[PDB]
Nucleic acid binder design. Structure first.
Ligand SMILES: [Mg+2]
Length: 1044
RNA sequence: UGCUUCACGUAGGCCUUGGAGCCGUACAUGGUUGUAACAAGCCUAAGUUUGAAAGGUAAAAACAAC
């Protein structure tokens, strides 16, 4: 054991050198006014510490210039007469933040790994298989595009290698935490080596003198992020500016240029923060980044200096709410309704032009004002512009909450885990067809809201019973059918409708089932001429079976000149609406790539038709499905996938004939936006070129290349009747609002309206109850201010698409708040009794009624909520019997990170501590958050005091501590500090040390140390103050700190 | 001490998500050729909250060859 004991001496020397050199916990304070203390520069920190333990130290430092000055030597901007007052806390060393960050990172990552493990166990140690599919959803900010492409192809080859990599990086993170939480430790995880011995190793397999692949992965990720930030900052640099953000960009590019994974022979400070913020939560990484960096509120360019550490982070998927579920749905509906929608229908272009002019004129008037109360008096006219408008999702959520979907099947979005299960679980063409589809049918439950919205449509499945057979029929329900379903629910409870004969109650699900059966039985026996039920004969049965010509007619030139013109103006409209945006490189991905690919496909099709190739010669020269997926993947991430071998393998070779018009310009520009403007300009030039060559000789020239076809064939009816029978669509007017109280009076009152529909009746009924609609403001306060260019006869151009779309807005808003009102019935137990005022015409030169003061939903969105903070245990267990607390929480700060923060700290601060209820009588979220974060700000101070005390303990008796790590049939872990060793201990050593005590325990000190390690709120505030005061006095006895 | 940060702790302080041109979960998102526009859009009635009927564009969802 001579080599073993020699390993002990060399590890002891390494540990001693590490403790002497790299285990510095030295705090440091800023310059300016903080460094002006001079003599009390020698004595500041403990003078703060006593202030934050209870002692009365007055801030009697009032140093003044004491006179009037003329020279620049005075130069002090001392307009704030108060001094430091020993309440602000100084910057601590990186080791304390790293210790807390690695402990929190190991906690949250072990929690996420355990959750992924139980999810994959119930759904059917490196998380191999679909375990890494969930873990790769979680690991970065959704950066699993290569893994998604691999499971879409079916390779399942990168998953095992990525699983090893994840296991190795988890062990590296665990060893980094175990180093950083302790004082007496080998310098292993900082300078990646094998000081353990490489032969005597009881499953401490950190590196085994071969896992420099962990280092390779670390430099790969660090350098990828570094050159990505260099490219981004280069793109910002040459932008326009007032020579002020140019110097800021120069400072940022000075900071990023540097860093590196290796400094001297160690990982150094930046890469440790990179690993920690990679393994942390998003808010935890942001907090540790803004504690590490001196910048408090990052603005302009400097967000990138934060973002360098917060680019990866963790995903943190959505949370399942159990107490305030309906209140959260009400808040979401109100947040949707508090915003002006952005309709893309033209002839509303002056509306949004005036909206943009008004908003740009008032956002500059928001500045150059005084205080915060006068700012809102000018900010109140700025109209928010909405994001989503998911009317179909909210309708289907209302039908899901009341369990109105029974005996059905609803298409839901496809997950990568479902794709992998379909891959491992396997007529081959049926499986190939199901593989291409991105939706799946399953029985709807309450806890499922992944509804498939494909161009505002939803998909249903019905089980009609022709001759006892179980023929499943897919439908496609229009968004104006579910809206009428919600109306029939919301007017008459226990919904029913009556038909033309015997006037029964028809139970709309049974109406849909009978309609599917009747459509099947009518398609099976032609009958496309008679009307169906009472709808029409042409509102069902499309033009493939109704209108037909016996002989396929010759394609005329005017049809081609119309198709070319409509494609040209559609491309021009897209180009103008993309150039109108402030950041053009964020608009679309399915639309920008498809324009380029349709351009190259049309150019290839013309070049291959005029050269007269074959039928199969087109297909094998084109892009296959896997080749399409590769093309879309390498075009979406063109800045990342530019220099790889696959890019030049599939683009510059193997496919040079197809991609011919773009390879000339692909060697100059280095972005997706670079290869988009050239392609759309080439498309416009090509359409303008071939528009003038559609003479009668070149009629077949621009035929099958453009896919222009006339009407159908008479013989092609029986084949269509066997494929349009299943998978047809449901029109919006299948159900009739005949027996609703007020229908006949409305039809009698509105008789000189020849173009009326049931949506006017829905508008009248839901406006009888009172409610805003987002369109009364649009046509009574902003509309009369704008002058419109006329038509040849009409006073406004584009009438039939101007008002109708507005009506298509209006009743939809009158739907949505009604649903929200229902959730208030599920929230407080009482009806919504607030009265809403009407609106009047403006008839003035300017606009006087502010959107933020006249929209009632925007006023409700800023006024309080009720909540229940009953505590929750681990896993998906039920709420335990605990006292229920109510606080006043704003609806804005009611998102998912509040749902994490509440169970993290708010319940333990309400229960264990004793807060005051305030003037109102209920707690407020702002004061609670301020008190919790103020009580957690001193926590790294606590760990600094503990580390200084332990360093002073282990610096003496170093041979005594080293002699009690001999062997355990091999090399032990060289760390001794664990505060619970059975031979000599360390909490007992501090317990019988110079710690004065009257009410104390060694177990209490261990509990306090575990709490300051893991950032958990203290059980008793008073005992924690006693421990803090004892440690402050013990540190001040031996002159341990640099403040002595 | 040190390759570091210049800032006196905590909470506050909103149009179009610039700094993420390579993020992301609320979907026309899996290709070529023929058949496919009932559903969803987009244009055509109106100085006002009239989505009917009609006339063009329009391929979401589907069938047969690779
Ligand atoms: Mg119509």
């Amino acid at each position: 054991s001579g080599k073993i004991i020699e390993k002990l001496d060399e590890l002891k020397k390494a540990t001693q050198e590490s403790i002497e050199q790299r285990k510095k916990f030295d705090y440091r304070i800023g310059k300016g006014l903080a460094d002006k203390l001079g003599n009390e520069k020698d004595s500041y920190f403990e003078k703060y510490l006593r202030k934050t333990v209870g002692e009365n130290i007055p801030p009697k430092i009032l140093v003044k210039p004491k006179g009037g000055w003329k020279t620049e030597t005075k130069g002090k901007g001392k307009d704030w007469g108060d001094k430091i007052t020993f309440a602000a806390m100084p910057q601590h060393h990186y080791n304390t933040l790293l210790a807390m960050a690695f402990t929190k990172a190991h906690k949250v990552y072990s929690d996420i790994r355990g959750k992924v493990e139980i999810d994959a166990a119930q759904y059917e140690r490196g998380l191999s298989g679909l375990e890494y599919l969930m873990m790769s959803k979680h690991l970065f900010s959704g950066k699993n595009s290569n893994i998604k492409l691999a499971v879409k192809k079916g390779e399942t080859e990168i998953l095992k290698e990525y699983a090893l990599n994840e296991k190795l990086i988890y062990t590296v993170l665990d060893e980094l935490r175990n180093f950083h939480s302790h004082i007496f430790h080998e310098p292993g995880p900082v300078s990646f080596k094998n000081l353990y011995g490489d032969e005597y190793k009881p499953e401490k397999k950190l590196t085994e003198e071969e896992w420099a692949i962990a280092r390779d992965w670390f430099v790969n990720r660090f350098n990828d992020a570094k050159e990505h930030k260099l490219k981004t900052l280069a793109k910002v640099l040459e932008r326009e500016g007032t020579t002020e953000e140019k110097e800021d960009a120069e400072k940022v590019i000075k900071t990023i240029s540097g860093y590196s994974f290796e400094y001297n022979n160690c990982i150094s400070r930046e890469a440790l923060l990179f690993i920690a913020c990679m393994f942390l939560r998003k808010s935890d990484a942001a907090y540790f980044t803004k504690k590490w960096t001196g910048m408090k509120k990052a603005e302009g360019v400097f967000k990138s200096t934060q973002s360098f550490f917060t680019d990866n982070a963790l995903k943190e998927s959505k949370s399942i709410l159990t107490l305030n579920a309906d209140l959260y749905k009400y808040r979401q509906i109100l947040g949707v309704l508090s915003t002006m929608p952005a309709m893309k229908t033209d002839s509303l272009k002056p509306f949004y032009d005036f909206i943009k002019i008004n908003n740009d004129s008032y956002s500059e008037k928001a500045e150059k004002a005084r205080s915060k109360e006068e700012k809102e008096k000018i900010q109140a006219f700025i109209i928010p512009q909405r994001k989503s408008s998911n009317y179909t999702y909210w309708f289907m959520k209302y039908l899901n909450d009341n369990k109105l979907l029974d005996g059905f099947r609803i298409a839901y979005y496809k997950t990568p885990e479902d794709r992998f299960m379909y891959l491992i679980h396997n007529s081959l063409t049926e499986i190939y067809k199901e593989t291409q589809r991105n939706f799946v049918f399953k029985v709807p439950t309450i806890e499922n809201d992944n509804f498939c919205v494909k161009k505002l449509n939803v998909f249903f499945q019905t089980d009609i019973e022709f001759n006892g057979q179980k023929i499943s029929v897919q439908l496609s329900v229009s968004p104006d059918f579910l809206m009428k379903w919600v109306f029939v629910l919301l007017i008459t409870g226990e919904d029913s409708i009556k038909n033309a004969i015997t006037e029964k109650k028809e139970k709309i699900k049974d109406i849909l089932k009978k309609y599917a059966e009747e459509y099947y039985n009518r398609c099976i026996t032609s009958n496309f001429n008679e009307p169906l039920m009472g709808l029409e004969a042409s509102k069902v049965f499309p033009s493939s079976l109704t209108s037909t010509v016996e002989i396929d007619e010759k394609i005329d030139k005017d049809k081609i000149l119309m198709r070319i013109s409509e494609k040209y103006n559609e491309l021009t409209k897209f180009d103008e609406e993309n150039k109108s945006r402030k950041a053009p490189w964020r608009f679309a991905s399915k639309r920008k790539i498809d324009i380029i690919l349709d351009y190259v496909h049309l150019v290839y099709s013309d070049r291959a038709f005029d050269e007269k190739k074959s039928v199969d010669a087109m297909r094998h020269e084109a892009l296959n499905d896997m080749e399409y997926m590769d093309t879309f993947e390498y075009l979406r991430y063109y800045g990342r996938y530019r220099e790889t071998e696959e890019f030049k393998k599939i683009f510059f070779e193997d496919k040079k004939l197809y991609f011919s018009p773009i390879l000339k310009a692909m060697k100059q520009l280095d972005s997706l936006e670079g290869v988009f403007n050239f392609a759309i300009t080439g498309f416009l030039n090509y359409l303008k070129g071939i528009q003038s060559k559609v003479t009668d000789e070149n009629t077949n020239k621009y035929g099958k290349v453009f896919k222009v076809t006339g009407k159908s064939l008479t013989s092609k009816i029986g084949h269509h009747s066997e494929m349009f029978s299943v998978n047809h669509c449901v029109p919006q007017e299948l159900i009739k609002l005949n027996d609703i109280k007020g229908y006949m009076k409305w039809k009698h009152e509105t008789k000189d309206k020849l173009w009326i529909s049931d949506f006017a009746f829905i508008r009248n009924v839901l406006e009888s109850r009172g409610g805003f609609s987002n369109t009364d403001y649009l046509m009574k306060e902003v509309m009369p201010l704008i002058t419109f260019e006329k038509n040849e006869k009409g006073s406004i151009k584009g009438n039939t698409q101007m008002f109708v779309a507005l009506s298509r807005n209006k009743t939809n808003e009158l739907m949505l708040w009604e649903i929200g009102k229902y959730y208030w019935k599920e929230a407080t137990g009482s009806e919504f009794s607030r009265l809403f005022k009407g609106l009047e015409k403006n008839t003035g030169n300017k606009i006087t009624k502010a959107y933020r003061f006249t929209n009632p939903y925007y006023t409700i969105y800023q006024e309080d909520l009720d909540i229940k903070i009953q505590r929750k245990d681990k896993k998906g267990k039920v709420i335990v019997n605990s006292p229920v607390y109510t606080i006043k929480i704003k609806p804005k700060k009611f998102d998912d990170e509040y749902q994490y923060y509440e169970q993290e700290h708010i319940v333990d601060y309400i229960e264990n501590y004793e807060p005051k209820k305030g003037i109102d009588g209920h707690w407020h979220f702002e004061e609670l958050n301020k008190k919790i974060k103020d009580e957690l700000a001193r926590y790294l101070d606590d760990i600094y005091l503990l580390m200084t005390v332990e360093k002073h303990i282990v610096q003496k008796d170093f041979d005594k501590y080293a002699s009690l790590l001999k062997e355990k049939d091999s090399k032990l872990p060289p760390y001794y500090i664990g505060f619970k060793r059975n031979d000599i201990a360390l909490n007992k050593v501090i317990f019988d040390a110079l710690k004065h005590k009257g009410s104390f325990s060694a177990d209490d000190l261990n509990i306090y140390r575990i709490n300051v390690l893991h950032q958990i709120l203290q059980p008793k505030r008073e005992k924690y103050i006693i421990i803090r005061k004892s440690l402050i006095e013990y540190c001040a006895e031996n002159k341990l700190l640099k403040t002595m």
